[PDB]
């Protein structure tokens, strides 16, 4: 009965409001949340599973830096993987890589 209900509700094109503490059932069916917290109802535009596994945004103004710097490390690391150490281009990429790694340490 639960399996049949799950199949049917995934197809239903109308509005569904479900209360369940079976988070699996919720996570399969629901795409948005109304959370009852601290005597307030807040609407969140995310799945049940994502809301719980969130991580506070206390340093969300800094994650932007950690994201950009790390993505540069990935780009330079990728190129180095394809080039022999004997190519003069290797030297420049390695210096930048070590310098960028220092920045990563400073942000952490």
């Amino acid at each position: 009965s639960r399996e049949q209900l799950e199949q049917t509700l995934s197809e239903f094109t109308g509005t569904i409001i479900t209360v369940s503490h079976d988070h699996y059932f919720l996570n399969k069916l629901c795409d948005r949340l109304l959370v009852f917290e601290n005597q307030q109802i807040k609407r969140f535009e995310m799945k049940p599973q994502e809301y719980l596994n969130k991580d506070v945004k206390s340093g969300d103004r800094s994650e932007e830096a950690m994201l950009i710097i790390e993505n540069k490390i990935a780009l330079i690391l990728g190129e180095l993987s394809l080039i022999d150490q004997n190519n003069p281009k290797y030297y420049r990429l390695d210096e930048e890589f070590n310098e960028l790694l220092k920045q990563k340490r400073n942000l952490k």
Partner: protein, 155 residues
């Protein structure tokens, strides 16, 4: 285009808040060249922002955009059989463009009756970064981080 980068277009600062960002959002809200409607919507929204929060509307708006503007986006690249999403840094101008666009679009989808109210609520959510537009920014950052391996690829 192939020739090379093309001259971007300036906007005048809004008469009331003396802000180019406000003016740009007004253009993003405008439909069918009806700039009147969009200016009225925004000014009414900013009154709701000040009347609700009590803080200055501009400060709330600027705080909201900060939470919306993305830093890394993903660009698709067809590498043989499978298509790879390559993470790319977002130019400062593009950050502003995406922020205003995302804000406006998701604001239009909200459930309040009037756009000004809708827009106001959306900006407030972004101020606390819990709205739809915020979620969009989360998604792109997830995609970029997930496909971080392929950053090497690029044009």
């Amino acid at each position: 285009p192939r020739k090379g980068p093309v001259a971007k277009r300036d906007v005048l600062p809004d008469p009331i808040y003396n802000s180019k960002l406000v003016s740009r959002l007004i253009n993003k809200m405008m439909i069918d060249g009806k700039k009147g409607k969009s200016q009225t919507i925004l000014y009414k929204s900013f009154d709701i922002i000040k009347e609700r929060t009590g803080n200055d509307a501009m400060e709330v708006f600027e705080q909201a955009l900060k939470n919306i503007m993305p830093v890394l986006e993903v660009k698709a690249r067809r590498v043989g059989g499978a298509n790879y999403q390559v993470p790319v840094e977002v130019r400062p101008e593009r950050r502003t463009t995406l922020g205003l666009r995302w804000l406006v679009n998701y604001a239009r989808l909200r459930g309040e009756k009037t756009m000004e109210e809708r827009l106001a609520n959306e900006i407030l959510d972004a101020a606390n970064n819990t709205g739809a537009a915020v979620k969009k920014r989360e998604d792109t950052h997830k995609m970029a981080e997930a496909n971080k391996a392929f950053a090497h690829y690029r044009w």
